[PDB]
């Protein structure tokens, strides 16, 4: 009932936890997110995400699908800007069969010409569906506006590339980024000796391996949604800095979203700030993204098209308040309780815990128990929070919007 963690000579982290539950769940996490694409292979990691049931050396495309379904299985693939994660769930008696599959897909895909060719239109489908959620518009643009290089890359292949990702490119991406050095093999409901064993033999992939440069920019998308999404961010702090915890707390001061169904959000600075003047449909939330080597911090509005000027300003002003001192301890206590509570809740599940343990394994090289985390959140000073707010107001801005942007301001309109 304790997390066991080991690192191999070759750099591969292994974490497990025998909780003797009826279900077993294994993740292979990989420093292989969209940030690792260059201007020449854009979209490759997207295709790679979609491609997990193509034929491998060890099992046919048919065998992966039928074999996993036989036993009530699930094989699944997640990407952020920085990581990819291959997860298998099943009943505990069959982890053997699923590990076999997981190792095949990550260790020896074949990416046959005809299968890859065939999968190409899926790029468009998966992308098209994704872009239905207008948050994805704004957020992907936002990253593109903010950075010039890696974190700039969108997670979904750009149109000009759909049809045009090659077998060779898929191969290169895997061979170059799926290396022992850049993987974490996480395991809930299995024995740690057996994970070590598996990783020693089967994840022995010879280590085949720029800082993200935030520049600041602005990207507008005209349509006629009549609701305008906008995000406004400044450079923040990377994960693992105590600055990072400062921003996280500032996020929860300003308000990152609702705690009550149909809520008024009495406790959200931002929400009440907007609402003191504009009395119609809107939403607002602090945005906080913290990456290996950078971070974005700010807020996101959803306003009427006509009201976006009035809303974005009202929101920005609220952050200026914090930056110029106005923050009670009541407020910062509320913030920390929220963050503390929300953290613990986010690791309530098998899903959430696995993601956290694997996440940390890559990012640091270690496990931080929830107790220590809470200490680090308690350890943030109201001065640190006022500093983080100061940092945003004064820092160089990146912005992205979409909607009928008639009354949506440019950065240089404050």
């Amino acid at each position: 009932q304790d997390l066991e963690f080991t690192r191999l000579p070759n750099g591969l982290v292994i974490a497990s936890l025998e909780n003797y539950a009826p279900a077993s769940r294994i993740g292979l996490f990989i420093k292989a997110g969209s940030r690792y694409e260059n201007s020449n292979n854009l979209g490759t990691s997207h295709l790679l995400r979609l491609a997990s049931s193509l034929t491998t050396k060890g099992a046919s495309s048919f065998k992966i699908t039928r074999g996993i379904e036989a036993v009530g299985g699930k094989l699944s693939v997640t990407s952020t800007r920085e990581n990819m994660a291959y997860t298998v769930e099943c009943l505990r008696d069959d982890v053997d069969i699923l590990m076999e599959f997981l190792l095949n897909v990550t260790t020896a895909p074949e990416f046959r010409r005809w299968e890859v060719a065939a999968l190409q239109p899926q790029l468009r489908i998966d992308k098209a569906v994704a872009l239905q959620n207008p948050q994805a518009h704004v957020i992907e643009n936002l990253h593109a506006a903010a950075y010039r290089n890696a974190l700039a890359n969108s997670l979904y292949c750009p149109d000009y590339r759909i049809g045009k990702v090659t077998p060779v490119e898929l191969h290169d991406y895997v061979q170059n980024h799926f290396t022992s050095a850049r993987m974490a093999l996480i395991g809930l409901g299995v024995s740690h000796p057996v994970l070590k064993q598996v990783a020693e033999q089967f994840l022995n992939i010879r280590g085949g391996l720029a800082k993200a440069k935030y520049h600041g920019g602005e990207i507008r998308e005209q349509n006629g949604d009549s609701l305008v999404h906008a995000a406004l961010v400044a450079e923040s702090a990377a994960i693992g800095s105590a600055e990072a915890n400062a921003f996280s707390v500032l996020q929860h001061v300003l308000g990152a979203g609702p705690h009550v169904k149909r809520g008024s959000n009495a406790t959200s600075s931002l929400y009440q700030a907007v609402a003191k003047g504009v009395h119609q449909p809107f939403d607002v939330s602090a945005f906080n993204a913290s990456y290996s080597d950078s971070g974005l911090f700010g807020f996101y509005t959803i306003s009427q098209a006509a009201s976006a000027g009035d809303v974005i300003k009202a929101a920005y002003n609220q952050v200026k308040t914090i930056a110029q001192g106005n923050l009670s301890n009541p407020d910062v206590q509320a913030a920390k309780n929220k963050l503390k509570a929300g953290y613990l809740m986010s690791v309530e599940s098998s899903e959430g815990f696995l993601d956290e343990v694997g996440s940390q394994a890559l990012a640091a090289g270690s496990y931080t128990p929830p107790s220590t985390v809470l200490q680090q959140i308690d350890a943030v000073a109201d001065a640190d929070v006022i500093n983080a707010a100061k940092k945003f107001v004064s820092g160089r801005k990146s912005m992205a919007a979409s909607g009928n942007l008639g009354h949506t301001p440019f950065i240089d309109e404050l």
Partner: peptide, 27 residues
């Protein structure tokens, strides 16, 4: 969307995570 109630909880604060599966819909 035609009301604050329904609209709220849309404002993003998660940098995005794309997840696609074998036998579970994409998100």
């Amino acid at each position: 969307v035609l009301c604050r109630e329904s609209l709220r909880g849309q404002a993003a604060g998660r940098p995005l995570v794309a997840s696609v599966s074998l036998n579970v819909p994409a998100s």
